[PDB]
C-alpha positions as a LaTeX table, in Angstrom:
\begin{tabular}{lrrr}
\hline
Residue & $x$ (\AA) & $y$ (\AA) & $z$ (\AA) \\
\hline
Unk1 & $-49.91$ & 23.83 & 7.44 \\
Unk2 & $-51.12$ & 26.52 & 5.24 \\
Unk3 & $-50.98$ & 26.04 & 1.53 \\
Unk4 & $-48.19$ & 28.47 & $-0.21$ \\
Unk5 & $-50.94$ & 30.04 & $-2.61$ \\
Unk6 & $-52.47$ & 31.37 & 0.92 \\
Unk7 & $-49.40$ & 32.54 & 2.56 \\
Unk8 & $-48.74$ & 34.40 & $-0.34$ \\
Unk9 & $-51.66$ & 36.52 & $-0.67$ \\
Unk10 & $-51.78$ & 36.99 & 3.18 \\
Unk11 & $-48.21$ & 38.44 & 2.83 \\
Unk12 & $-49.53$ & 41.00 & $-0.41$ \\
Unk13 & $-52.77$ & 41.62 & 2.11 \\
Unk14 & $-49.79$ & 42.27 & 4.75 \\
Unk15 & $-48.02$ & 44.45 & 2.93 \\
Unk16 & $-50.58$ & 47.06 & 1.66 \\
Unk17 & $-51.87$ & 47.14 & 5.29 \\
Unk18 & $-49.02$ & 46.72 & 7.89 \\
Unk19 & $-48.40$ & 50.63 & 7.51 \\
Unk20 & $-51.57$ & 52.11 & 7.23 \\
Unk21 & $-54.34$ & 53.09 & 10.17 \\
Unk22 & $-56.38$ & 50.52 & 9.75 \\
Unk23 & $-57.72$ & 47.96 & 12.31 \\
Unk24 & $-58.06$ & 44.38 & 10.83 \\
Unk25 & $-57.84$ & 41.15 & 12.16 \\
Unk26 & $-57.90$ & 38.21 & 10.03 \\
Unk27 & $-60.92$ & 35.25 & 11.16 \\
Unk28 & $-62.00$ & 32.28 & 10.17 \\
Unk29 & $-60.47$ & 29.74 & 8.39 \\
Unk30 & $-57.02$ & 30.88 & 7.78 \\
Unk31 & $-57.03$ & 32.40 & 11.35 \\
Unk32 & $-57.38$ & 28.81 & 12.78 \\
Unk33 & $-55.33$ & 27.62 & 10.78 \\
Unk34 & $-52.52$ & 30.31 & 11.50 \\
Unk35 & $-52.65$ & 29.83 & 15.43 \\
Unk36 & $-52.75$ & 25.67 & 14.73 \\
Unk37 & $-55.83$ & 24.32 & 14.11 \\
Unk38 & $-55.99$ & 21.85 & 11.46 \\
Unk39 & $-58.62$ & 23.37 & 9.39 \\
Unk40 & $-58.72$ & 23.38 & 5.87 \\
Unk41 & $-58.42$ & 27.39 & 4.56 \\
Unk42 & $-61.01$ & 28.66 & 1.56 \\
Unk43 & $-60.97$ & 32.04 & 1.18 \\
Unk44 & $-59.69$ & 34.93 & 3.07 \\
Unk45 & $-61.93$ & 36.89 & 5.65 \\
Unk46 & $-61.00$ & 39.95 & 7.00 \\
Unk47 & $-62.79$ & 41.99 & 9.70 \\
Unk48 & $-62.41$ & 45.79 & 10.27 \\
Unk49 & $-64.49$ & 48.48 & 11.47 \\
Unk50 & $-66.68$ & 50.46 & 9.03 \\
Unk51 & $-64.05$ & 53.01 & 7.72 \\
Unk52 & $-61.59$ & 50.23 & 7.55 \\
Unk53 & $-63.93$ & 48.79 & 5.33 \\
Unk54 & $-63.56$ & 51.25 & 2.85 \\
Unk55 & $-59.93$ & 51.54 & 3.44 \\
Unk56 & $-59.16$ & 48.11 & 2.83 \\
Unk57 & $-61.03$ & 48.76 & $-0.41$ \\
Unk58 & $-59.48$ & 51.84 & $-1.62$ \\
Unk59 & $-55.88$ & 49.94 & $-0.85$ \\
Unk60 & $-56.67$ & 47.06 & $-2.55$ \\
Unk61 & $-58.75$ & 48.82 & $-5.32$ \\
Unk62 & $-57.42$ & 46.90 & $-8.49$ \\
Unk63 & $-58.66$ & 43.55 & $-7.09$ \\
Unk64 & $-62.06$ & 44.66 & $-6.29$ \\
Unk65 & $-64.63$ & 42.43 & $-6.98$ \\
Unk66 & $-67.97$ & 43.50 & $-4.88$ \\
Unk67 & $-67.73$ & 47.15 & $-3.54$ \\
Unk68 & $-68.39$ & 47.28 & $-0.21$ \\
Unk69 & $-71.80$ & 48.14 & 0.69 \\
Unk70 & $-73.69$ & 48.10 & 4.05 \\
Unk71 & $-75.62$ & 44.56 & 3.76 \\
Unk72 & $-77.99$ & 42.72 & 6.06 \\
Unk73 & $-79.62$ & 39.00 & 6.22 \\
Unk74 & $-82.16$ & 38.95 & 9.44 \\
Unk75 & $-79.36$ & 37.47 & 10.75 \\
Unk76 & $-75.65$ & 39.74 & 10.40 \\
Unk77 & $-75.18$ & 42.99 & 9.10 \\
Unk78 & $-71.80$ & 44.64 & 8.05 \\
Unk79 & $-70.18$ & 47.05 & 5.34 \\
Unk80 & $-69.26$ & 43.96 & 3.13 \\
Unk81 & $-67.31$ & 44.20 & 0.20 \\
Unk82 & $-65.07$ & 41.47 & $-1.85$ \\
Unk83 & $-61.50$ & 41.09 & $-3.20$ \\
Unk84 & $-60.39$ & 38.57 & $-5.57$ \\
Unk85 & $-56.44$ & 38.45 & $-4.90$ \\
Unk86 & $-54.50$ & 36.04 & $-7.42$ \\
Unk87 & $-57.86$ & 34.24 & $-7.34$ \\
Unk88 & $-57.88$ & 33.33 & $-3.93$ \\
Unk89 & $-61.77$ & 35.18 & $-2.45$ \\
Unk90 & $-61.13$ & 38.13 & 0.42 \\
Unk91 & $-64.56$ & 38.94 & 2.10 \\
Unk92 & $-63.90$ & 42.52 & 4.09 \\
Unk93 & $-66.48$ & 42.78 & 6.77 \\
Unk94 & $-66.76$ & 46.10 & 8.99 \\
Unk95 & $-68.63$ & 46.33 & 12.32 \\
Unk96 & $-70.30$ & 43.18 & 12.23 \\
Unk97 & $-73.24$ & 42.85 & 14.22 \\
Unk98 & $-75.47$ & 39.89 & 14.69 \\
Unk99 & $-79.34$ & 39.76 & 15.38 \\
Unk100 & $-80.49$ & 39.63 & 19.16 \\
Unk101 & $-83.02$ & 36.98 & 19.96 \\
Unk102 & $-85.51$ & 40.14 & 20.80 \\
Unk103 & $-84.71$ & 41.42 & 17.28 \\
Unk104 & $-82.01$ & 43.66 & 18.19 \\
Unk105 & $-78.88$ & 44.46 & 17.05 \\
Unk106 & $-75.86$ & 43.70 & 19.06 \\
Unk107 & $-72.68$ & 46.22 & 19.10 \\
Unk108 & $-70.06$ & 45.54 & 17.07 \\
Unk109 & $-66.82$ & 44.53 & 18.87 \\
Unk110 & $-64.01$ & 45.78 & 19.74 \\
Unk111 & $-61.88$ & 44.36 & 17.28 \\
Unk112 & $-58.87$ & 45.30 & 20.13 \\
Unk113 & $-60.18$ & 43.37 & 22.99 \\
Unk114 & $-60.07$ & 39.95 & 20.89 \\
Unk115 & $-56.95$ & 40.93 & 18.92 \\
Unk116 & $-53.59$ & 39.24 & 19.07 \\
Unk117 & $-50.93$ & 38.60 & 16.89 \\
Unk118 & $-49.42$ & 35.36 & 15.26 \\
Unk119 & $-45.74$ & 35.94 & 14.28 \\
Unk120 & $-45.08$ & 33.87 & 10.67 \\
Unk121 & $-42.78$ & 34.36 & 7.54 \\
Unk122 & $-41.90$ & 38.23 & 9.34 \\
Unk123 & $-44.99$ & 38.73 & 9.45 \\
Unk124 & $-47.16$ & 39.96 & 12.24 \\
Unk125 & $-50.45$ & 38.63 & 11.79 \\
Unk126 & $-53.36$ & 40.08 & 13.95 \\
Unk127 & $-56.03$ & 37.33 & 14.42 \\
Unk128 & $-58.80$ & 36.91 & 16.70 \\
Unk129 & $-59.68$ & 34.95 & 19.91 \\
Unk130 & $-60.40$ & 31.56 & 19.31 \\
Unk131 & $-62.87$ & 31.72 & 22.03 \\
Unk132 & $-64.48$ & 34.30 & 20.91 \\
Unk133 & $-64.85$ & 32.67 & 17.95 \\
Unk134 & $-66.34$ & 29.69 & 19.06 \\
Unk135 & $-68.95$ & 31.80 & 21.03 \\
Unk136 & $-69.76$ & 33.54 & 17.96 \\
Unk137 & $-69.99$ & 30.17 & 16.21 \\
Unk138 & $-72.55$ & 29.16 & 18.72 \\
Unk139 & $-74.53$ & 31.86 & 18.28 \\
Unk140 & $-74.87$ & 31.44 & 14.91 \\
Unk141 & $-75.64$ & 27.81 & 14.31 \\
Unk142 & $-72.31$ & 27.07 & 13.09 \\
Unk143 & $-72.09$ & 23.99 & 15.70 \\
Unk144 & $-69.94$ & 21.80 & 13.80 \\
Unk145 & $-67.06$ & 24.38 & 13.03 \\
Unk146 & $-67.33$ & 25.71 & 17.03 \\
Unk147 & $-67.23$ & 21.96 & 17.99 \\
Unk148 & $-64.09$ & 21.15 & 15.76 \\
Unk149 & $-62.38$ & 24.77 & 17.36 \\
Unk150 & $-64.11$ & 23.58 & 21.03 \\
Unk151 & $-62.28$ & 19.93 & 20.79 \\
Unk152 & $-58.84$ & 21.28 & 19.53 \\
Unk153 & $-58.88$ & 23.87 & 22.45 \\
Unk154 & $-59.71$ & 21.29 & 24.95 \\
Unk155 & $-57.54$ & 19.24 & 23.70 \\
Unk156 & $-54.45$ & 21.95 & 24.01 \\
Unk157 & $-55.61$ & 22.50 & 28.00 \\
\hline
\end{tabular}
């Protein structure tokens, strides 16, 4: 499914992290695509916590591209920062936390409760919940990418 120029920098992503404290999940795009959704993958996202944020920086330091930085839209907030790994785009995003209708700020998650693991190339992947995912997706206007997750999952049932 996934093309080889993706598996390759998940496995150099892998390999800096697999043995350090840091909590990460991969989401998005290549984590559909890792537990079997037919999505095409662009770019890399990576969610963490906030000092994972920085950690995943200071690992990866050589392919930083945008340091990460606490950053807000009206909409999401998190410590956001950018890699550029054999030119394939990793976002980092820690303690992400989208906008309440009354103009609060939800908690971030815990990254734990929605982790699990896909097992590929001996690797170990943590990824997160589809369905939380899709909720997320909802809440964000992203309707067409939480209907294309909502049919395959249906579809799977």
């Amino acid at each position: 499914m996934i093309r080889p120029e993706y598996l390759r920098v998940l496995r150099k992503i892998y390999d800096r992290l697999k043995n350090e404290k840091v909590n990460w999940v991969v989401t998005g795009s290549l984590s559909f695509a890792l537990q079997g959704v037919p999505v095409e993958v662009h770019d890399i996202d990576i969610q963490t916590d906030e000092e994972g944020a920085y950690e995943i920086e200071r690992i990866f330091s050589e392919f930083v591209s945008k340091k990460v930085r606490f950053s807000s839209t009206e909409k999401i907030c998190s410590h956001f920062g950018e890699l550029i790994i054999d030119g394939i785009k990793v976002e980092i995003m820690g303690d992400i936390r989208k906008r309440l209708e009354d103009g609060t700020w939800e908690d971030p998650v815990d990254l734990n409760k929605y982790k699990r693991f896909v097992e590929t190339h001996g690797m170990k992947i943590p990824v997160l919940s589809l369905e939380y995912e899709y909720q997320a997706y909802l809440k964000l206007g992203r309707v067409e990418k939480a209907e294309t997750l909502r049919k395959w999952l249906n579809e799977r049932k």
